[PDB]
Amino acid sequence: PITFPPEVLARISPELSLQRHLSLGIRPCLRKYEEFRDVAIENNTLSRYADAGNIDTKNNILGSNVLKSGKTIVITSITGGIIEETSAEDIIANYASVYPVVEVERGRVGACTDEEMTISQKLHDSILHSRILPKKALKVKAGVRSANEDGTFSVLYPDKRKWSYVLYAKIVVLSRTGPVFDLCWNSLMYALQSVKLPRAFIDELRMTIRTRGRYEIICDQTKSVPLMINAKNIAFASNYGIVELDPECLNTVLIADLDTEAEETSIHSTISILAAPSGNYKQLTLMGGGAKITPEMIKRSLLLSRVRADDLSTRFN
Amino acid sequence: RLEIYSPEGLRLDGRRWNELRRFESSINTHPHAADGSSYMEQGNNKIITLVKGPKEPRLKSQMDTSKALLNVSVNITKFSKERSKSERRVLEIQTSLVRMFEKNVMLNIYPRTVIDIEIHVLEQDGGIMGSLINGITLALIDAGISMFDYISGISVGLYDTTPLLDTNSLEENAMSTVTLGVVGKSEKLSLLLVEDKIPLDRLENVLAIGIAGAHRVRDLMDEELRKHAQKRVSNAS
Amino acid sequence: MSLSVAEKSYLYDSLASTPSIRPDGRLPHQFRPIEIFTDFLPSSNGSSRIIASDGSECIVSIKSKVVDHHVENELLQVDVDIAGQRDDALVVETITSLLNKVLKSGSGVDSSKLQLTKKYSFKIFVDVLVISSHSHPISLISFAIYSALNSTYLPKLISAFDDELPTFHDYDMVKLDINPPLVFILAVVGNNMLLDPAANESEVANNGLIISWSNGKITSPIRSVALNDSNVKSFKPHLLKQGLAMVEKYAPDVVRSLENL
Amino acid sequence: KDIEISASESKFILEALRQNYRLDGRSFDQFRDVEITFGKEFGDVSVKMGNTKVHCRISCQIAQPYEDRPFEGLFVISTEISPMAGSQFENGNITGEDEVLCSRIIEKSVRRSGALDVEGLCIVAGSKCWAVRADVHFLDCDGGFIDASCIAVMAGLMHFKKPDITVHGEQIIVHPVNEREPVPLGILHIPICVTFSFFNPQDTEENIKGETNSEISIIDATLKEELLRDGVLTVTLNKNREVVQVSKAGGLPMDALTLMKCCHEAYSIIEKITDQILQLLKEDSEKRNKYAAML
Amino acid sequence: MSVQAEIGILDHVDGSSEFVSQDTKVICSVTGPIEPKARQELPTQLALEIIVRPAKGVATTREKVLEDKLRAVLTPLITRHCYPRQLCQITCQILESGEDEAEFSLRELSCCINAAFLALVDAGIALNSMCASIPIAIIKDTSDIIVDPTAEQLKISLSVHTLALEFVNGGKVVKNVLLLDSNGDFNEDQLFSLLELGEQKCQELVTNIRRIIQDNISPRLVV
Amino acid sequence: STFIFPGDSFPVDPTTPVKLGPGIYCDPNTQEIRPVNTGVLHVSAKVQTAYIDYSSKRYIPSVNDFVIGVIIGTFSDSYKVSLQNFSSSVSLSYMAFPNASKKNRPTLQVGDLVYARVCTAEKELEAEIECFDSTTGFGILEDGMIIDVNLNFARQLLFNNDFPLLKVLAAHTKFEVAIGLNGKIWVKCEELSNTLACYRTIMECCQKNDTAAFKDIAKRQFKEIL
Amino acid sequence: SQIVTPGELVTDDPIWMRGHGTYFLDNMTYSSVAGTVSRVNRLLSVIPLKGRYAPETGDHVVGRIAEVGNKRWKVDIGGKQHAVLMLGSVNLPKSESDELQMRSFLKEGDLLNAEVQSLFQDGSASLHTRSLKYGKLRNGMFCQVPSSLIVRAKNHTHNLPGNITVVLGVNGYIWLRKTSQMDLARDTSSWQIYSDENDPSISNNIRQAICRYANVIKALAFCEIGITQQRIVSAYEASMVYSNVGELIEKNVMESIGSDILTAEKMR
Amino acid sequence: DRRRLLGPAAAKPMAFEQELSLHTGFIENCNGSALVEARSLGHQTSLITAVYGPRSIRGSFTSQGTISIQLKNGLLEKYNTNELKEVSSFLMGIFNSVVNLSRYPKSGIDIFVYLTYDKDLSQISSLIPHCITSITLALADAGIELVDMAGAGEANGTVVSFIKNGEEIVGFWKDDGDDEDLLECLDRCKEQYNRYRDLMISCLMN
Numbered sequence A: 001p002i003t004f005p006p007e008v009l010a011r012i013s014p015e016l017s018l019q020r021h022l023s024l025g026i027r028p029c030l031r032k033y034e035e036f037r038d039v040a041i042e043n044n045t046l047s048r049y050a051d052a053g054n055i056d057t058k059n060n061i062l063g064s065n066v067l068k069s070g071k072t073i074v075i076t077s078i079t080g081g082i083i084e085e086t087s088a089e090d091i092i093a094n095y096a097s098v099y100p101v102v103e104v105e106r107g108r109v110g111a112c113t114d115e116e117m118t119i120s121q122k123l124h125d126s127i128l129h130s131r132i133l134p135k136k137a138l139k140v141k142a143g144v145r146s147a148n149e150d151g152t153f154s155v156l157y158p159d160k161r162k163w164s165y166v167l168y169a170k171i172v173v174l175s176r177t178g179p180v181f182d183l184c185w186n187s188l189m190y191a192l193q194s195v196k197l198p199r200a201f202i203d204e205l206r207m208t209i210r211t212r213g214r215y216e217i218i219c220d221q222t223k224s225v226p227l228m229i230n231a232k233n234i235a236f237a238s239n240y241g242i243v244e245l246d247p248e249c250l251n252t253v254l255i256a257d258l259d260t261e262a263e264e265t266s267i268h269s270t271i272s273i274l275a276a277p278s279g280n281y282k283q284l285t286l287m288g289g290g291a292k293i294t295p296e297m298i299k300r301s302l303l304l305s306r307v308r309a310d311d312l313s314t315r316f317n
Numbered sequence B: 001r002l003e004i005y006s007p008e009g010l011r012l013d014g015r016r017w018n019e020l021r022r023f024e025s026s027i028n029t030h031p032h033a034a035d036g037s038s039y040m041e042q043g044n045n046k047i048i049t050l051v052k053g054p055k056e057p058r059l060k061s062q063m064d065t066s067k068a069l070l071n072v073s074v075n076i077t078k079f080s081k082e083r084s085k086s087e088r089r090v091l092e093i094q095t096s097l098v099r100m101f102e103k104n105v106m107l108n109i110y111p112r113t114v115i116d117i118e119i120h121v122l123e124q125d126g127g128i129m130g131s132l133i134n135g136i137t138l139a140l141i142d143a144g145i146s147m148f149d150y151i152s153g154i155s156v157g158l159y160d161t162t163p164l165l166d167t168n169s170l171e172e173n174a175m176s177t178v179t180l181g182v183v184g185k186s187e188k189l190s191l192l193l194v195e196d197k198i199p200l201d202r203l204e205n206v207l208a209i210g211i212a213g214a215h216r217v218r219d220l221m222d223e224e225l226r227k228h229a230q231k232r233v234s235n236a237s
Numbered sequence C: 001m002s003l004s005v006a007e008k009s010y011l012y013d014s015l016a017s018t019p020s021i022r023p024d025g026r027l028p029h030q031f032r033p034i035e036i037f038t039d040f041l042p043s044s045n046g047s048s049r050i051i052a053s054d055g056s057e058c059i060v061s062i063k064s065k066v067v068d069h070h071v072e073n074e075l076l077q078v079d080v081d082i083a084g085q086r087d088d089a090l091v092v093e094t095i096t097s098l099l100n101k102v103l104k105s106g107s108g109v110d111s112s113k114l115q116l117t118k119k120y121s122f123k124i125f126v127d128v129l130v131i132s133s134h135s136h137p138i139s140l141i142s143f144a145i146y147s148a149l150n151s152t153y154l155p156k157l158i159s160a161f162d163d164e165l166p167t168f169h170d171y172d173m174v175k176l177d178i179n180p181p182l183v184f185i186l187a188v189v190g191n192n193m194l195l196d197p198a199a200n201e202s203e204v205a206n207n208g209l210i211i212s213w214s215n216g217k218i219t220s221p222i223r224s225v226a227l228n229d230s231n232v233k234s235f236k237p238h239l240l241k242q243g244l245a246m247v248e249k250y251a252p253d254v255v256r257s258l259e260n261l
Numbered sequence D: 001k002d003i004e005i006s007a008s009e010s011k012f013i014l015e016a017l018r019q020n021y022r023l024d025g026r027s028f029d030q031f032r033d034v035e036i037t038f039g040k041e042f043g044d045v046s047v048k049m050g051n052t053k054v055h056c057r058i059s060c061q062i063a064q065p066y067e068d069r070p071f072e073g074l075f076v077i078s079t080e081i082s083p084m085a086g087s088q089f090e091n092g093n094i095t096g097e098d099e100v101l102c103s104r105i106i107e108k109s110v111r112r113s114g115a116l117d118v119e120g121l122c123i124v125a126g127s128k129c130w131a132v133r134a135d136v137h138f139l140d141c142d143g144g145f146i147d148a149s150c151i152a153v154m155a156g157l158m159h160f161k162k163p164d165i166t167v168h169g170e171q172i173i174v175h176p177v178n179e180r181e182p183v184p185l186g187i188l189h190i191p192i193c194v195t196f197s198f199f200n201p202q203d204t205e206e207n208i209k210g211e212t213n214s215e216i217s218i219i220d221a222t223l224k225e226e227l228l229r230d231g232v233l234t235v236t237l238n239k240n241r242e243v244v245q246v247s248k249a250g251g252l253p254m255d256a257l258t259l260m261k262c263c264h265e266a267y268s269i270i271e272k273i274t275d276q277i278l279q280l281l282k283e284d285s286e287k288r289n290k291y292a293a294m295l
Numbered sequence E: 001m002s003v004q005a006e007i008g009i010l011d012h013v014d015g016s017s018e019f020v021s022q023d024t025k026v027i028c029s030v031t032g033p034i035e036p037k038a039r040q041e042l043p044t045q046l047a048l049e050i051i052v053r054p055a056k057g058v059a060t061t062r063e064k065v066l067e068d069k070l071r072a073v074l075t076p077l078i079t080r081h082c083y084p085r086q087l088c089q090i091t092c093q094i095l096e097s098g099e100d101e102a103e104f105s106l107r108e109l110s111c112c113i114n115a116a117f118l119a120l121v122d123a124g125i126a127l128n129s130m131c132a133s134i135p136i137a138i139i140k141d142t143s144d145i146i147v148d149p150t151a152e153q154l155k156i157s158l159s160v161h162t163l164a165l166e167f168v169n170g171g172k173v174v175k176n177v178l179l180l181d182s183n184g185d186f187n188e189d190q191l192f193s194l195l196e197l198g199e200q201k202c203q204e205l206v207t208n209i210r211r212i213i214q215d216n217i218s219p220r221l222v223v
Numbered sequence F: 001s002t003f004i005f006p007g008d009s010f011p012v013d014p015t016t017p018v019k020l021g022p023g024i025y026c027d028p029n030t031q032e033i034r035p036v037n038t039g040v041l042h043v044s045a046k047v048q049t050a051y052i053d054y055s056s057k058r059y060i061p062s063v064n065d066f067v068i069g070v071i072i073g074t075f076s077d078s079y080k081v082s083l084q085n086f087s088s089s090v091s092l093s094y095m096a097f098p099n100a101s102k103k104n105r106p107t108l109q110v111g112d113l114v115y116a117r118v119c120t121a122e123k124e125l126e127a128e129i130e131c132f133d134s135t136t137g138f139g140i141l142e143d144g145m146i147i148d149v150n151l152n153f154a155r156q157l158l159f160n161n162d163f164p165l166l167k168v169l170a171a172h173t174k175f176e177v178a179i180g181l182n183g184k185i186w187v188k189c190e191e192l193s194n195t196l197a198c199y200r201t202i203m204e205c206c207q208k209n210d211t212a213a214f215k216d217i218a219k220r221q222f223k224e225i226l
Numbered sequence G: 001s002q003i004v005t006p007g008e009l010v011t012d013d014p015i016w017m018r019g020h021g022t023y024f025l026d027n028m029t030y031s032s033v034a035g036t037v038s039r040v041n042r043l044l045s046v047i048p049l050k051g052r053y054a055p056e057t058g059d060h061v062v063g064r065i066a067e068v069g070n071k072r073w074k075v076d077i078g079g080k081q082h083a084v085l086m087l088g089s090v091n092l093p094k095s096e097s098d099e100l101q102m103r104s105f106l107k108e109g110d111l112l113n114a115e116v117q118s119l120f121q122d123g124s125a126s127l128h129t130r131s132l133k134y135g136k137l138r139n140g141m142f143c144q145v146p147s148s149l150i151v152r153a154k155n156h157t158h159n160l161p162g163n164i165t166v167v168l169g170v171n172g173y174i175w176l177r178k179t180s181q182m183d184l185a186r187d188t189s190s191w192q193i194y195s196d197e198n199d200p201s202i203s204n205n206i207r208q209a210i211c212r213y214a215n216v217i218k219a220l221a222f223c224e225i226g227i228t229q230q231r232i233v234s235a236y237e238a239s240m241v242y243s244n245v246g247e248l249i250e251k252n253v254m255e256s257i258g259s260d261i262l263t264a265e266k267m268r
Numbered sequence H: 001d002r003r004r005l006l007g008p009a010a011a012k013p014m015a016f017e018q019e020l021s022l023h024t025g026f027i028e029n030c031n032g033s034a035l036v037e038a039r040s041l042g043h044q045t046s047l048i049t050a051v052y053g054p055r056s057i058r059g060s061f062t063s064q065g066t067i068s069i070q071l072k073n074g075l076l077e078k079y080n081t082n083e084l085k086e087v088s089s090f091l092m093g094i095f096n097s098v099v100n101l102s103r104y105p106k107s108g109i110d111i112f113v114y115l116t117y118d119k120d121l122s123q124i125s126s127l128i129p130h131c132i133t134s135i136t137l138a139l140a141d142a143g144i145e146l147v148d149m150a151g152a153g154e155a156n157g158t159v160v161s162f163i164k165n166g167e168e169i170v171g172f173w174k175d176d177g178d179d180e181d182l183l184e185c186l187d188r189c190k191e192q193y194n195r196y197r198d199l200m201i202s203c204l205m206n
């Protein structure tokens, strides 16, 4: 036989680096089989409504979240927009979503990678299907601005054209070591809870004929309302992997929260879950490329995802 | 006031139906920037044409062992029109010019080389496709690159029944136009471009006037070219 | 621009020598001859065309547009288009940002000179086109912009200054007498400064300087540009003071050379 | 990826043209038989020409008209190529030579010509209008992509029916198909593209300075014929004796009168095609009214 | 359920198929093994170029996700190590979505999986096993598990699922679950009732897929 | 001869020695012999040869196959040949000709049609063909027309002598045919009208897959040529 | 001599040998370029008025190394194609070890002096430096004029007054250097012939004379005057009227230098 | 953009001394990283740098390295694209005279500067010195040879970067500002240079 140091075997064959670790009972990321990465969160840090008094007039971010789980750093910022409505239960048609732009910062520079694009769509689709954001929560309660007394303009909001808010998300990822969708989703969930929608108004003609030669909605620089998401439908992400133990390096193990090149490259049986605390599961992804996904792994992955969701929502009050 | 085509037969600039615009060409306008160069002044149009090559390609991958590579790049400057802040249409102009001079320039006799054509439109005013053709024909001849014959460009609009030779911007927006690329003095068409509706029966008359006007443009170009050559050999004598 | 290391080492020794021996016998403050043409684009309020001695050519077009200066913060806009260079390429973006700072409605240029009514002023669109370039063209562009803005003529106003839109005379036109700035580029070769650095001179220079000039005084922006990447080295502070004094001394000669209309 | 043609094949097909023979048994002036299939939905149309297969899908959504043209609806055409029509095509390069030219022909033949009545798409003059979209899917390529797309788009626009809408001032209520029946689109004319492929049986010197022109012209070339041609001409006509557009960009220089005889040649075909399209539409409509009586 | 399909309909690809489940309709082309690009080359095994085109408009990231999920099903189905340093072009053109594209895509995914499988069958590419995909939805107030749901049923569905299983031994053994894409609100007890009934209807589909494949390929060969 | 699908149970028992042909795969991990192609599984009698006849149009180079290629490039010691469009190129050595010497190189130019036999077809290497007999009709195919055909039709035309296509064609004209197992069939006659009539008949007969229709198709095609 | 343009008929006589810049259909022979008709023996040809330098066997050229390949260099000569410089065609200071470290002699961007040994079928030149007069250039500066101004002559490396030597490449690539001892041997040890180091004793007087010769060569080219050894020294002596070498860059000065040479040769 | 989710097109956007903290080696994909967080009485700024390299360029005869510096607006899109590339150009000019490029031939070094926080209790002038601080730290963590510790300071629009204890200048930048300020500006900028350089060296040791 011939053995190589750990530093080369990771490069020589990431498949063996995992199997050698699993034969010893450990994982390449030095965590236990069902151990997650520890997360630390900073909320509303990049928001223009961060300081309750001194509101940043230049900033346009409505909500933010900085997330660190292991070596990976994920930073999310929520921006806004208003569209004019031109149109006439728990069913999907009455629910909206947000539009993310994921930038996974690596040594390359250029166009959007398939990873960046798929995560962006996966985020948008799951916020919709989990019924987190209802369309009613984005309708603009618009006011009116009139010139009071003589000079100063006063804005009066109610306690006719119609508008609706549009939410955009930019998610940057630093120090990517493994699958990063779960970090992006969980980071976006914390950010969405800190979102504050600015108030809108209009002042008290294009088609009319004009002599030679001779309107839109405006946001409030201070006043803001909270984004009314259905908190019961907020879910949290966790990923799992099913590995078959090689006899030389029949039997399977379940791995929680995949990280490092060794795990990501070689594990082809994955389980992705979005689970709402106390509530039901919002998303389940089974991919049986590797070992046979038996009901026992499914039942165990569902069990670990519940305690992971309970941990993530509770840990940060 | 002005009219498009008055009852007396006068157009906006005062031309009759078979009158060209003021045509002025120049050769060897940028010797310290290209092998062959040409400055086109057809009416209000102002076009710089730069021919670089035949030369060694930059990437050995993009190189043909059997013939030269011909590339055309048309840059329409921001100040050519009444400024707009705003593509797929410029791409059509480029590949069309390439396909034209592919069959005219003897690319087979310049193998493993690359002929880059660099165009800058300084001022635009109708019939720019024909003026682009004239700029390339002169600039390639100035570069000493072998070609079978001249290619002359011309545009003709149809006002009711009367073809209006050499159209300007307002005439193009008023009536349908045909753009011709005529090989030398023949009736062979390198480029035929009917950009909008024309009655099938009135189209042959438009083509006839265009071919005739193009032949005049060819002689005007040839005249200017022989003048430059005769002035060059007389100065050196 | 490719050079053999035997070429570079011979050039650098000649330039950094005391006194500097430039490859054309030029003095450290002497400029290369240029040809200038003005008023050739009738569709524009002003035009200029400059041809450097090395073959570099640049065309500038000045165009106007009446705007409400209460909503138009910047009343002067430069668009640089360098031939054979992406519009998002670093050199284009850098020169565009730099030139916009050189003009900028309230710094180098006199904003009040563009005013028409109490509500409306002229916005000037300075469009730059570099047909050919062999070195950093910021100085060549600046000279061409300078010549264009001087030959610029604008329509004469009729309506009153106090405020409908303004009304202009059909025939008569007024000249634009704004004071346009000048951007000079310098080469730092050893302990010597060189005005108007040539291509080969810049290939061996240790550092470079971009110095602006307006109304007879040194103005901003001022940058330390790297004219290459192989032989870039730090320079002593006295060299920075020496280059600035060089511009303040010989730029008036450049102005009266350009101003000869 | 390139399509390699053997020297024996290039000689045989060209020598067969000199003997007035086409591999698929057609004559030089014979346009392929156009087969038009309609789906269940309005705007689903599938065109077949021998082996060439295209599919078009007409769709519309409510949008706002441009401020410059406030009385006008919107209309756009999409013709992105995919490797399904053959491995010779790269996935969605909308900048390739043939891709750019062919796209501009369909745009000039259907969009620029105003075959669709963009005034009828306007709902209310200031905002709210219809934004129609014509998406073309090249399924199988045996040549004649331009001619097949032009027929597919027009057959789709005519077969398509937009949903009926009722406006209450600023309120635009888009009625579903189950509430009120949809209204068809307004077609001002039916343009048809006929593409001529030229073959030079001699040298380039006999084409620039030759007395007797010997260039061979065939209508609607197959893939093998298209790959061997020395020139191409796409002419567009309608039954109103209008030349909608002509495109002969570069290639083998052609005698002007020869190109003119091509335009008159194509008018005989575009009459057969226009009447054929209208007939298959009438037959399709009669089928739906027969099932409306059974329902 | 009841599905209709064809095989070998395109002339300029190595394999082709058309698959219709209710109103969803996908045509699929397969070309391989062919010379790969330099960027795509894999030394040990076969590389896959999977493309999905929408029924309307241009391709968006929505189809990029369908391409990713389709790769997850097809990759373990192809015996990739038989074609080292080669390429396979699986191209899916969705013709009629059969669902409100704004909210749902599971019918298109399930149809692309079957169409891609059939086109790989028509192309003669080495396959380890068989495959069938079904879309499933759980309807709002009735809480019933509707296999192969209609476009109207999906509008009032509280959860939507795509199930694609790997079949061996005459389509009676379930080798693995190639993809289970569940979206919406559901619990553990609902999920396993879904997987049970889903495997039953999946087993009905391979049996129907085996029948359609045999009816198309048997007349092509000699006995 | 039974119909088999991929992943089905393989009928043959391991106790019998078997030589594996196309369609059957031996798992490197599980060592189980299982099918990977869908078609008819043929098994011999007495040393038993088993294979699956499956439909395909993309050729894969295998040894002892007769193929028609086209020269697309000349290298230092070999020719770059293409047996099918978009497929990987094939190498044809200069020494792979009858009476080959280091003094006389072959006279083939780019674009010539070559009829050859596959000698080395390594899955991880560039395939190779030869123009000399392995046991001692190859060479350049001058002029003529090449026909695209599916691989099952090409194998049936070369090995099954009961295939009526070659008989009904000889009954109409005198023709020279070269059959390639990569889907390319080369035909050449004295007159162009006959070669085209053979192209059209082979094209239509390839589309029907019905052997009993070859005679009627040939009769109408040569009648249309007249 | 007749001036013709593309497409023009040059002769209807078919009993002619078709030369360059021509093409024909049956008896009619046309011109492919705008140039002058040349009738030599039986070879009718058109000499183009413009075009890059076309190399001929025996030309003394100055070139820049463009790329380093397999066992050859591609040199920028100023023509349509790169010229090749085979490893066997250079005097190395053969071993198979040197075939790998080719960049130890000539690297990309190096300037050299060579002779056109032959031409390929496409027209590109094969170079060789199998002599003492050919090799890498140093101890000076490069400058180029159009190839049409360099008249092919018996010799192309001339020693000028002031201890400066010029290399007038037929392709128009000129090299000015300090007159080396080897250059003095040209009237009727060196182990490192590819050294990238310059002779570290180049005085300022020698450096200033290189500039003056550079400017007068540029001035002669600016007037489109043919560059010869007799004209370079005549312009160099005439330019002494101007004290500073810098004055020679202005247009009026350059046109004066060229005019004073032409009018002086009219008297002579 | 087809490669993004930009929502509806009809939607329009919404219209309404210095304490330092340095860390290195916290990013796993790059060769060297650094974090600079600066809190002043009037502005707080945080930014992260990442240095990838040297990475060999395919078929590169370059005798030395090729530095690339991309200044990204990581989340906070406060600064215009024109000015970011101008600062990137300025930054590349500095470090092209500090990195011992001769030691890394045929290769290339790519530097990324992500802005992560910027609130002022244009402004791009005062941002440059903290990028220089971060790039020098990140290049040292990546094991790239530096001729000196490159640092800079800012004063009234003037930005000066020093080496060799302020004896020589590696970069100079001046926007707006007053006249004849040079002498006083070089003094105030050298003070920040020494302060940042001491903290930078103290960071790499401890």
Ligand SMILES: [Cl-]
Residues within 6 Å of the ligand: B128
């Ligand atoms: Cl245009």
Ligand SMILES: [Cl-]
Residues within 6 Å of the ligand: G064, G076
């Ligand atoms: Cl050079």
Ligand SMILES: [Mg+2]
Residues within 6 Å of the ligand: A103, A104, A109, A110, A111, A112, A113
């Ligand atoms: Mg990116």
